[PDB]
C-alpha cells in the first residue's frame, strides 16, 4: 500500500528465521535474519542477502510447499514504509538508497507497526553467507529493552499465529 515498502516476514522453514525486505529499484531487496530484529542498539544481528522479491510479495502470508525455496509457513510479521536517513546530510554526504546499498551502508528510519525508528544494515567482507550486520541505531534510552519477538509474535496483517497460518494454508 504505501511506498517505499519495508516488510519483515517471519518464516518457519528449515529453521525459524525472519526475512527483512526493503523496496528499491523496483524490487524488494531481501536479507534472511536468523534471530529477527532487536530493539537494543548493542545487539548485532546477522543479515544474509537473499534473492530480490517482487513488490507484491510484501503481503504474502500462507504456506509454500516443503522442499521449495521459501518452503514452510510465511507470516507478515511487520510492514510499513521507511525513510532513507542518508539523504539528510550536507551536500556531498547525501546517498540515495541504491547508492547506500551499493556502498554496503544503509541507514533508514523504519515506519512499521512493530519496529519504528532508526536501523542500520552494514555490509561485511568476511562474515559467512555474505553477511551484513543489522542493528538498531544508537539513541538515548533508559531501561532494559523489550524482546520484540516475544512481545509481538503474530501477524501484523491478520493477527494470526504461525500455527493458524500453517493450518489455514
Ligand atoms: Mg525464505
Among 40, 44, 46, 29, CA closest to 117:
40
Residues 6+ apart with CB under 8 A from 134: 20, 31, 33, 37, 44, 45, 46, 47, 119, 120, 121
C-alpha 88 to ligand 1 mean position (Å): 33
Which residues lie near ion ligand 1 (Cβ < 5 Å)?
Answer: 11, 70
C-alpha 123 to ligand 1 mean position (Å): 20
C-alpha 69 to ligand 1 mean position (Å): 7
Number of alpha carbons in the 13 Å side-chain half-sphere of residue 8? 30
| Total domains in the fold of the chain | 1
C-alpha 140 to ligand 1 mean position (Å): 34
Task: Say how far apart CA 29 and CA 91 lie, in whole Å.
Answer: 27
Task: Say how far apart CA 137 and CA 93 lie, in whole Å.
Answer: 19
Note down the domain range covering 81.
1-169
What Å resolution does this PDB entry report? 1.8
Task: Say how far apart CA 106 and CA 99 lie, in whole Å.
Answer: 9
State how far the alpha carbon of 135 is from the alpha carbons of 11, 103, 125, 148, in Å. 20, 17, 17, 13
Helices assigned H by DSSP within the chain: 97-103, 148-151, 162-168
Experimental method: X-ray
Q: What is the DSSP string of 39-55?
A: S-TT--EEEEEEEEE-G
C-alpha 57 to ligand 1 mean position (Å): 12
State how far the alpha carbon of 27 is from the alpha carbons of 72, 82, 86, 103, 168, in Å. 22, 15, 20, 18, 28
Q: Three-state DSSP class for 31?
A: strand
Task: Say how far apart CA 19 and CA 76 lie, in whole Å.
Answer: 10
Amino acid at each position: 500500500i504505501k511506498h517505499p515498502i519495508y516488510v519483515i516476514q517471519k518464516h518457519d522453514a528449515s529453521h525459524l528465521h525472519y526475512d527483512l525486505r526493503l523496496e528499491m529499484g523496483g524490487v524488494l531487496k531481501s536479507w534472511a535474519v536468523p534471530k529477527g530484529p532487536s530493539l537494543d542498539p548493542k545487539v548485532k544481528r546477522l543479515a544474509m542477502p537473499t534473492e530480490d522479491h517482487p513488490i507484491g510479495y510484501a503481503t504474502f502470508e500462507g504456506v509454500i510447499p516443503e522442499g521449495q525455496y521459501g518452503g514452510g509457513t510465511v507470516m507478515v510479521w511487520d510492514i510499513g514504509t521507511y525513510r532513507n536517513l542518508r539523504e539528510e546530510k550536507p551536500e556531498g554526504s547525501r546517498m540515495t538508497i541504491e547508492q547506500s546499498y551499493d556502498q554496503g551502508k544503509i541507514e533508514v528510519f523504519l515506519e512499521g507497526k512493530k519496529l519504528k525508528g532508526s536501523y542500520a544494515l552494514i555490509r561485511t567482507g568476511g562474515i559467512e553467507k555474505r553477511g551484513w550486520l543489522f542493528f538498531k541505531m544508537k539513541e538515548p534510552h533508559e531501561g532494559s529493552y523489550e524482546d520484540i519477538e516475544k512481545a509481538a509474535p503474530d501477524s501484523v496483517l491478520t493477527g494470526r499465529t504461525m500455527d493458524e497460518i500453517a493450518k489455514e494454508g
